[PDB]
Amino acid sequence: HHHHHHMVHITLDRNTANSWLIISKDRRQVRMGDTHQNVSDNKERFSNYPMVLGAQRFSSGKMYWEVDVTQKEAWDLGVCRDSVQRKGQFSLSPENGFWTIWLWQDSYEAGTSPQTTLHIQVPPCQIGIFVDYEAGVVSFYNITDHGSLIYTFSECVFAGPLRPFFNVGFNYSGGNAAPLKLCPL
Numbered sequence: 001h002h003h004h005h006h007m008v009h010i011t012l013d014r015n016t017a018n019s020w021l022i023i024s025k026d027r028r029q030v031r032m033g034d035t036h037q038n039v040s041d042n043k044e045r046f047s048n049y050p051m052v053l054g055a056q057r058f059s060s061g062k063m064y065w066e067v068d069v070t071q072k073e074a075w076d077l078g079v080c081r082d083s084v085q086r087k088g089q090f091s092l093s094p095e096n097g098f099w100t101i102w103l104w105q106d107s108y109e110a111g112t113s114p115q116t117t118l119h120i121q122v123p124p125c126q127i128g129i130f131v132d133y134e135a136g137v138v139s140f141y142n143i144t145d146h147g148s149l150i151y152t153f154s155e156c157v158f159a160g161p162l163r164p165f166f167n168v169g170f171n172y173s174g175g176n177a178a179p180l181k182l183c184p185l
């Protein structure tokens, strides 16, 4: 892919974070804390899952960013509507306003309804995410494997402004404490 030149500087929005997340000073890294993090509750925070949004909102154009997932066992990445549900249980699907992939139990899957099996030969340490708003496309690239395509959502019905979306995952196993990091341009 030649999407690198639509690179955007993404930062995390503290106010949307689950109350157990720890966002770095530079707002470029997030990890699961071992407790509640001593913040007030608000209507933006994801309550049920270790999720956070980017601060940036996109309503046009082409955008590209990269995320480091080194040594994590579980995570979700992609984009979502600004108006997605924050409280209670929900599935990651385009019907609910999410365009995402994930790692879970040693398999990679795209967040379609129902979920789609991904075929990745080289486990990624960094993921590239490309959004073309006008085309209705969200694509995922394996930066560890020379940028190889992972998955393309096409004919997307965004139906609103988009935000970068992150889930660091739970750490029941003790093997999933590592952060998500936004990689430098």
Ligand SMILES: CNC(=O)c1ccc(S(N)(=O)=O)cc1
Pocket (backbone or CB within 6 Å): 020, 032, 033, 034, 169, 170, 171, 172
């Ligand atoms: C409301 N959150 C929880 O009940 C919760 C919070 C943290 C964990 S972990 N991943 O073991 O650190 C599990 C569950």
